[PDB]
């Protein structure tokens, strides 16, 4: 089963690590718990953004150029990446944008963190049809002494 996961700001916008205008430890936990002991696929830009294999998960880099680092698995295509994954119950796609769109049509599920914040960004998560997706979980949180902004966790299943 293929899965997508992201953090979005107002208007489907998605941003970089250092760009991360927000500060939500809670979202991170959420993400870790939803990716742990699972494979994660990602673009090179994200590779780069992160700087180190993410521990406890199989890190696969989807990219057109040859790899530049033995700690990870470099893939040249959607198909190649899914194959490298082997038989697992869930594949978590983590971006970037191009990444997202390339797999959405394959996804069966979505993990989204809705963040109450307006920001200028380049990229957007792919416009996904809400009538095709069914909301199976939600949980809203007000900002707090650790969480800089209000947020909502949401999981959707493809009807
Ligand atoms: N919901 C959601 N939130 C995100 O922040 C997110 N980030 C990416 C891409 N960027 C990143 C950047 C850093 C780390 C990182 O260190 N992750 C640690 C959590 C570390 C902590 O608590 O400091 C991990 O082990 O997963 C993960 C993804 C993709 N989907 C996301 N999805």
CSV table of C-alpha atoms and ligand atoms in Angstrom, one decimal:
chain,number,residue,atom,x,y,z
A,1,UNK,CA,0.0,0.0,0.0
A,2,UNK,CA,1.3,3.5,-1.0
A,3,UNK,CA,1.1,6.5,1.4
A,4,UNK,CA,1.6,10.1,1.2
A,5,UNK,CA,2.6,12.4,4.1
A,6,UNK,CA,3.0,16.1,4.5
A,7,UNK,CA,2.7,19.4,6.4
A,8,UNK,CA,0.8,22.1,4.7
A,9,UNK,CA,0.3,25.7,5.3
A,10,UNK,CA,-2.5,27.9,4.1
A,11,UNK,CA,-3.5,27.0,0.6
A,12,UNK,CA,-1.7,23.7,0.1
A,13,UNK,CA,1.7,25.4,0.3
A,14,UNK,CA,4.7,23.2,1.3
A,15,UNK,CA,8.2,24.5,2.5
A,16,UNK,CA,11.9,23.8,3.3
A,17,UNK,CA,13.5,22.8,6.6
A,18,UNK,CA,15.2,26.1,7.3
A,19,UNK,CA,12.3,27.8,5.7
A,20,UNK,CA,10.1,26.1,8.2
A,21,UNK,CA,8.6,29.3,9.5
A,22,UNK,CA,6.8,27.3,12.0
A,23,UNK,CA,7.9,25.4,14.9
A,24,UNK,CA,5.9,22.2,15.8
A,25,UNK,CA,7.7,19.5,17.6
A,26,UNK,CA,4.3,17.7,17.8
A,27,UNK,CA,4.0,17.5,14.1
A,28,UNK,CA,7.5,15.9,14.0
A,29,UNK,CA,6.6,13.3,16.5
A,30,UNK,CA,3.6,12.5,14.4
A,31,UNK,CA,5.6,12.2,11.4
A,32,UNK,CA,8.1,9.9,13.0
A,33,UNK,CA,5.6,7.7,14.4
A,34,UNK,CA,3.9,7.4,11.0
A,35,UNK,CA,7.1,6.6,9.0
A,36,UNK,CA,9.0,4.5,11.5
A,37,UNK,CA,9.9,1.0,10.5
A,38,UNK,CA,8.6,1.9,7.0
A,39,UNK,CA,10.4,2.9,3.8
A,40,UNK,CA,10.4,6.4,2.8
A,41,UNK,CA,10.8,7.7,-0.8
A,42,UNK,CA,12.0,11.2,-1.6
A,43,UNK,CA,13.3,13.7,-4.0
A,44,UNK,CA,16.9,14.8,-3.9
A,45,UNK,CA,16.0,18.2,-2.7
A,46,UNK,CA,14.5,16.7,0.3
A,47,UNK,CA,17.5,14.4,0.7
A,48,UNK,CA,19.7,17.4,0.7
A,49,UNK,CA,17.4,19.3,3.0
A,50,UNK,CA,17.6,16.6,5.7
A,51,UNK,CA,21.3,15.9,5.5
A,52,UNK,CA,21.3,12.4,7.0
A,53,UNK,CA,19.5,9.2,6.4
A,54,UNK,CA,16.5,9.2,8.5
A,55,UNK,CA,17.1,6.6,11.3
A,56,UNK,CA,15.0,3.4,11.6
A,57,UNK,CA,13.6,3.6,8.1
A,58,UNK,CA,14.8,2.5,4.7
A,59,UNK,CA,15.7,5.8,2.8
A,60,UNK,CA,15.2,5.7,-0.9
A,61,UNK,CA,16.1,8.6,-3.2
A,62,UNK,CA,14.2,9.1,-6.4
A,63,UNK,CA,16.3,11.0,-8.7
A,64,UNK,CA,17.5,11.3,-12.3
A,65,UNK,CA,21.2,11.8,-11.5
A,66,UNK,CA,23.5,9.2,-10.2
A,67,UNK,CA,23.8,9.1,-6.4
A,68,UNK,CA,26.5,10.8,-4.3
A,69,UNK,CA,26.2,8.9,-1.0
A,70,UNK,CA,26.4,5.2,0.1
A,71,UNK,CA,24.2,5.6,3.2
A,72,UNK,CA,21.1,5.6,0.9
A,73,UNK,CA,19.3,3.8,-2.0
A,74,UNK,CA,19.2,5.7,-5.2
A,75,UNK,CA,16.3,5.1,-7.5
A,76,UNK,CA,15.7,6.3,-11.2
A,77,UNK,CA,11.9,6.0,-11.4
A,78,UNK,CA,8.5,5.5,-9.8
A,79,UNK,CA,8.6,1.9,-10.7
A,80,UNK,CA,12.2,1.4,-9.6
A,81,UNK,CA,11.4,2.9,-6.2
A,82,UNK,CA,8.4,0.8,-5.5
A,83,UNK,CA,10.3,-2.3,-6.5
A,84,UNK,CA,13.2,-1.4,-4.2
A,85,UNK,CA,10.6,-1.3,-1.5
A,86,UNK,CA,9.9,-5.0,-1.9
A,87,UNK,CA,6.9,-6.5,-0.1
A,88,UNK,CA,5.8,-4.2,2.8
A,89,UNK,CA,2.5,-3.2,3.9
A,90,UNK,CA,3.1,0.5,3.6
A,91,UNK,CA,5.4,2.9,1.6
A,92,UNK,CA,5.5,6.4,2.9
A,93,UNK,CA,6.1,9.1,0.2
A,94,UNK,CA,7.6,12.3,1.9
A,95,UNK,CA,8.0,14.7,-1.0
A,96,UNK,CA,9.0,16.9,-2.5
A,97,UNK,CA,6.2,18.3,-4.7
A,98,UNK,CA,7.1,16.6,-7.9
A,99,UNK,CA,7.3,13.6,-5.8
A,100,UNK,CA,4.0,14.0,-4.4
A,101,UNK,CA,2.2,14.3,-7.7
A,102,UNK,CA,4.1,11.4,-9.2
A,103,UNK,CA,2.7,9.1,-6.5
A,104,UNK,CA,-0.6,10.5,-5.5
A,105,UNK,CA,-2.3,8.5,-8.2
A,106,UNK,CA,-1.0,5.5,-6.7
A,107,UNK,CA,-1.6,6.5,-3.2
A,108,UNK,CA,-4.4,4.9,-1.2
A,109,UNK,CA,-3.9,7.1,1.7
A,110,UNK,CA,-3.0,10.4,3.0
A,111,UNK,CA,-1.4,11.8,6.1
A,112,UNK,CA,-1.8,15.5,6.5
A,113,UNK,CA,-1.0,18.1,9.0
A,114,UNK,CA,-3.0,21.3,8.4
A,115,UNK,CA,-1.2,24.3,9.7
A,116,UNK,CA,-2.9,27.6,10.6
A,117,UNK,CA,-0.3,29.8,8.8
A,118,UNK,CA,-0.2,32.0,5.7
A,119,UNK,CA,3.1,31.8,3.8
A,120,UNK,CA,4.8,32.6,0.5
A,121,UNK,CA,5.9,29.6,-1.2
A,122,UNK,CA,6.9,28.3,-4.4
A,123,UNK,CA,5.4,24.8,-4.3
A,124,UNK,CA,2.0,23.4,-3.5
A,125,UNK,CA,0.8,19.9,-2.6
A,126,UNK,CA,-1.1,18.5,-5.6
A,127,UNK,CA,-4.8,19.5,-5.8
A,128,UNK,CA,-6.5,16.3,-4.7
A,129,UNK,CA,-10.2,15.8,-5.2
A,130,UNK,CA,-12.0,15.8,-1.8
A,131,UNK,CA,-14.9,13.8,-3.1
A,132,UNK,CA,-12.5,10.9,-3.8
A,133,UNK,CA,-11.1,10.9,-0.4
A,134,UNK,CA,-12.7,9.9,2.8
A,135,UNK,CA,-11.7,11.4,6.1
A,136,UNK,CA,-11.1,8.7,8.7
A,137,UNK,CA,-9.3,10.8,11.4
A,138,UNK,CA,-8.8,14.3,12.6
A,139,UNK,CA,-7.4,16.0,15.6
A,140,UNK,CA,-7.0,19.7,16.1
A,141,UNK,CA,-4.6,21.4,18.4
A,142,UNK,CA,-4.3,24.9,19.6
A,143,UNK,CA,-0.9,26.4,19.6
A,144,UNK,CA,1.0,26.0,22.9
A,145,UNK,CA,4.2,26.6,24.7
A,146,UNK,CA,5.9,24.3,22.3
A,147,UNK,CA,3.8,24.6,19.3
A,148,UNK,CA,4.1,27.9,17.6
A,149,UNK,CA,1.0,27.4,15.5
A,150,UNK,CA,-2.5,25.7,15.6
A,151,UNK,CA,-2.6,22.4,13.7
A,152,UNK,CA,-4.7,19.6,12.5
A,153,UNK,CA,-3.9,16.1,11.9
A,154,UNK,CA,-5.8,14.4,9.2
A,155,UNK,CA,-5.8,11.0,7.6
A,156,UNK,CA,-7.8,10.2,4.5
A,157,UNK,CA,-8.5,6.9,2.7
A,158,UNK,CA,-9.4,6.6,-1.0
A,159,UNK,CA,-13.0,5.7,-1.4
B,1,LIG,N1,3.6,16.1,8.5
B,1,LIG,C1,4.7,16.3,8.1
B,1,LIG,N2,5.6,17.1,8.8
B,1,LIG,C2,6.9,17.4,8.3
B,1,LIG,O1,7.6,18.2,9.0
B,1,LIG,C3,7.3,16.7,7.1
B,1,LIG,N3,8.7,16.9,6.5
B,1,LIG,C4,8.9,16.3,5.4
B,1,LIG,C5,10.2,16.5,4.8
B,1,LIG,N4,11.2,17.1,5.8
B,1,LIG,C6,11.6,16.5,6.9
B,1,LIG,C7,12.7,17.3,7.7
B,1,LIG,C8,13.4,16.8,9.0
B,1,LIG,C9,12.9,15.5,9.5
B,1,LIG,C10,13.4,14.8,10.8
B,1,LIG,O2,14.5,14.9,11.5
B,1,LIG,N5,12.7,14.0,11.2
B,1,LIG,C11,12.9,13.2,12.5
B,1,LIG,C12,12.2,13.9,13.5
B,1,LIG,C13,13.2,14.7,14.5
B,1,LIG,C14,12.9,15.4,15.8
B,1,LIG,O3,12.1,15.2,16.6
B,1,LIG,O4,13.8,16.3,15.9
B,1,LIG,C15,12.5,11.7,12.3
B,1,LIG,O5,13.2,10.9,12.7
B,1,LIG,O6,11.5,11.4,11.5
B,1,LIG,C16,11.8,14.7,8.7
B,1,LIG,C17,11.2,15.3,7.4
B,1,LIG,C18,7.9,15.6,4.9
B,1,LIG,N6,6.6,15.3,5.4
B,1,LIG,C19,6.4,15.9,6.5
B,1,LIG,N7,5.1,15.6,6.9
